[PDB]
Amino acid sequence: QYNPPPIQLEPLAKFSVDLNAPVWELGTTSDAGKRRIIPITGGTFEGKSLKGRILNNGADWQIVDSKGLAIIDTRYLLETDDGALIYLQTKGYRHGSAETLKQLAQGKDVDPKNYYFKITMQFETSSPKYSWLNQTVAVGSAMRLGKAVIYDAYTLK
Ligand SMILES: [Cl-]
Ligand SMILES: [Cl-]
Ligand SMILES: [Cl-]
Ligand SMILES: [Cl-]
Ligand SMILES: [Cl-]
């Protein structure tokens, strides 16, 4: 039978992104919401097959709407432990979790507030060791921690 194969998520690496620069708050640049340019200054990643650091390059070019949805749109740059460069783009959404927003709507003090923060990932490299990532779909589960984002990256197998 013709069912497509089952989906498995294979751990890629744990990312720790540093945002150690002031945010450029451009205000409401269209009906879509507030434009925020959030510099990416460095960080690290650590997984079985992929390890290294994030360089000082790029940003999240974010839009925050009137309902507290953030739309993520990034460009940044990885340097593996063995010296390969990998251009990364992430896209996705950050918003209050359904339960957190329900509690707030009832006047119930929520501690801590929880968020839906999920991304898709696109890679570009010329290194033969890492070029599989040029043609593999990948996703992340993220969390803000002050001027940092931590996320677990997975490939679709
Ligand atoms: Cl930059
Ligand atoms: Cl949710
Ligand atoms: Cl979060
Ligand atoms: Cl963010
Ligand atoms: Cl902070």
Coordinates of C-alpha atoms and ligand atoms in Angstrom, one line a residue:
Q1 CA 0.0 0.0 0.0
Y2 CA 0.8 3.5 -0.9
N3 CA 0.9 5.3 2.5
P4 CA 3.9 7.5 2.8
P5 CA 6.6 6.5 5.2
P6 CA 6.2 7.3 8.9
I7 CA 7.8 10.5 10.2
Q8 CA 10.8 10.2 12.7
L9 CA 12.6 13.2 14.3
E10 CA 16.3 12.6 14.7
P11 CA 18.1 14.8 17.2
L12 CA 20.6 17.1 15.4
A13 CA 22.0 19.4 18.1
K14 CA 21.1 21.7 21.0
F15 CA 21.6 25.3 20.1
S16 CA 22.2 28.2 22.5
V17 CA 21.9 31.6 20.6
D18 CA 23.3 34.7 22.2
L19 CA 21.4 38.1 21.5
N20 CA 24.0 40.3 23.4
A21 CA 23.2 43.6 21.6
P22 CA 20.4 46.1 21.9
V23 CA 17.2 45.4 19.8
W24 CA 16.4 47.9 17.1
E25 CA 12.7 48.7 17.8
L26 CA 11.4 50.2 14.5
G27 CA 7.8 50.5 15.6
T28 CA 4.7 49.8 13.5
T29 CA 6.0 49.8 10.0
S30 CA 2.8 48.3 8.4
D31 CA -0.5 46.9 9.5
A32 CA 1.3 43.5 10.0
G33 CA 2.8 44.9 13.3
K34 CA 6.0 46.0 15.0
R35 CA 9.3 45.4 13.2
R36 CA 12.1 44.4 15.6
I37 CA 15.7 43.7 14.4
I38 CA 17.3 41.5 17.0
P39 CA 21.1 41.0 16.5
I40 CA 22.6 37.5 16.8
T41 CA 26.0 37.9 18.4
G42 CA 27.2 34.4 18.9
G43 CA 26.4 31.1 20.7
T44 CA 27.0 27.4 20.5
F45 CA 25.6 24.1 19.2
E46 CA 26.2 20.6 20.4
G47 CA 25.0 17.2 19.0
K48 CA 26.3 13.8 18.1
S49 CA 27.1 14.7 14.4
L50 CA 27.2 18.5 14.6
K51 CA 29.2 20.7 17.1
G52 CA 30.6 24.2 17.0
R53 CA 29.9 27.9 17.5
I54 CA 27.6 30.7 16.1
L55 CA 29.5 33.6 14.6
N56 CA 28.8 37.4 15.1
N57 CA 26.5 37.8 12.1
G58 CA 22.9 38.3 11.3
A59 CA 19.7 38.8 13.2
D60 CA 16.0 37.9 13.7
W61 CA 14.0 40.3 11.5
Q62 CA 10.9 39.9 13.6
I63 CA 7.3 41.1 13.3
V64 CA 5.1 41.3 16.5
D65 CA 1.3 41.7 15.7
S66 CA -1.4 43.2 17.9
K67 CA -2.3 39.9 19.4
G68 CA 1.2 39.0 20.7
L69 CA 2.2 36.7 17.9
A70 CA 5.9 37.0 16.9
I71 CA 6.8 35.9 13.4
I72 CA 10.5 34.8 13.3
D73 CA 12.7 35.3 10.2
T74 CA 16.5 34.8 10.7
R75 CA 19.8 34.7 8.9
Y76 CA 23.0 33.6 10.8
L77 CA 26.2 31.7 10.5
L78 CA 27.6 28.5 12.0
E79 CA 31.3 27.4 12.3
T80 CA 31.7 23.8 13.1
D81 CA 34.4 22.5 15.4
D82 CA 36.3 21.1 12.3
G83 CA 36.1 24.5 10.5
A84 CA 33.1 24.2 8.1
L85 CA 30.8 27.2 7.5
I86 CA 27.1 26.7 7.4
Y87 CA 24.6 29.5 6.5
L88 CA 21.4 29.0 8.6
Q89 CA 17.9 30.5 8.0
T90 CA 15.1 29.9 10.6
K91 CA 11.4 30.8 10.3
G92 CA 8.5 30.2 12.7
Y93 CA 6.2 31.5 15.5
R94 CA 6.2 32.5 19.1
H95 CA 3.0 33.0 21.0
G96 CA 1.4 32.4 24.4
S97 CA 0.4 28.7 24.9
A98 CA -3.3 28.0 24.7
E99 CA -3.5 27.2 28.5
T100 CA -1.5 30.3 29.5
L101 CA -3.8 32.5 27.4
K102 CA -7.0 30.8 28.9
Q103 CA -5.7 31.5 32.4
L104 CA -5.0 35.1 31.6
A105 CA -8.5 35.5 30.1
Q106 CA -10.0 34.4 33.4
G107 CA -7.8 36.7 35.6
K108 CA -5.7 33.9 37.0
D109 CA -2.1 34.8 37.7
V110 CA 0.1 32.4 35.6
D111 CA 3.6 31.5 37.0
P112 CA 5.5 31.0 34.8
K113 CA 3.8 31.9 31.5
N114 CA 4.4 29.2 28.8
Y115 CA 4.9 29.8 25.1
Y116 CA 4.5 28.0 21.8
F117 CA 7.9 28.6 20.1
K118 CA 8.7 26.4 17.1
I119 CA 10.8 26.9 14.0
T120 CA 11.8 25.4 10.6
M121 CA 15.4 25.4 9.6
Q122 CA 17.2 25.7 6.2
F123 CA 21.0 25.1 5.8
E124 CA 23.7 25.9 3.1
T125 CA 27.2 24.5 3.1
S126 CA 29.9 23.3 0.7
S127 CA 31.5 20.9 3.2
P128 CA 31.0 17.2 2.1
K129 CA 30.7 16.2 5.7
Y130 CA 27.7 18.5 6.3
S131 CA 26.2 18.8 2.9
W132 CA 23.4 16.4 3.7
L133 CA 21.8 19.3 5.6
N134 CA 21.4 21.1 2.2
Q135 CA 18.6 18.6 1.3
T136 CA 17.1 17.6 4.6
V137 CA 14.0 19.2 6.3
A138 CA 14.6 20.3 9.9
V139 CA 12.7 21.8 12.9
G140 CA 13.3 23.2 16.3
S141 CA 11.6 23.5 19.7
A142 CA 12.8 26.8 21.4
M143 CA 12.6 28.8 24.6
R144 CA 13.6 32.4 25.3
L145 CA 16.0 32.9 28.3
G146 CA 16.5 36.7 28.6
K147 CA 18.8 37.8 25.8
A148 CA 19.2 34.3 24.5
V149 CA 17.2 31.6 22.7
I150 CA 17.8 27.9 23.5
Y151 CA 16.4 25.2 21.1
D152 CA 16.6 21.5 20.3
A153 CA 17.1 20.9 16.6
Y154 CA 15.9 17.8 14.8
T155 CA 16.0 16.5 11.2
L156 CA 13.1 14.7 9.6
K157 CA 14.1 11.1 8.8
Ligands
CL1 CL 24.9 41.6 11.0
CL2 CL -0.3 26.5 22.1
CL3 CL 9.7 31.0 25.2
CL4 CL 12.4 35.9 20.1
CL5 CL 18.6 39.3 29.8

